[PDB]
């Protein structure tokens, strides 16, 4: 374990919301779809 410690070292924060914004666009498309449902009466 000491020699593996000496000779090995096993190494290895930002904004992204493309899934949340994809849900945003899907829910607003569903909202205008519900408006289109209410349009036919």
């Amino acid at each position: 374990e000491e020699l593996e410690t000496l000779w090995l070292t096993g190494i290895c924060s930002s904004q992204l919301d493309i899934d949340n914004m994809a849900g945003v666009f899907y829910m607003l498309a569903a909202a205008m779809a519900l408006s289109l449902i209410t349009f036919i009466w």
């Binding site: 919301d17 914004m21 666009f25 349009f39």
Partner: peptide
Amino acid sequence: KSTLWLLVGLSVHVVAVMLYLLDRFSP
């Protein structure tokens, strides 16, 4: 010792147009 906000702005540009469309459509 950003671009997604511009996408949201284009989205609300769509929103205002479709709200005026529902204003004209719905009695």
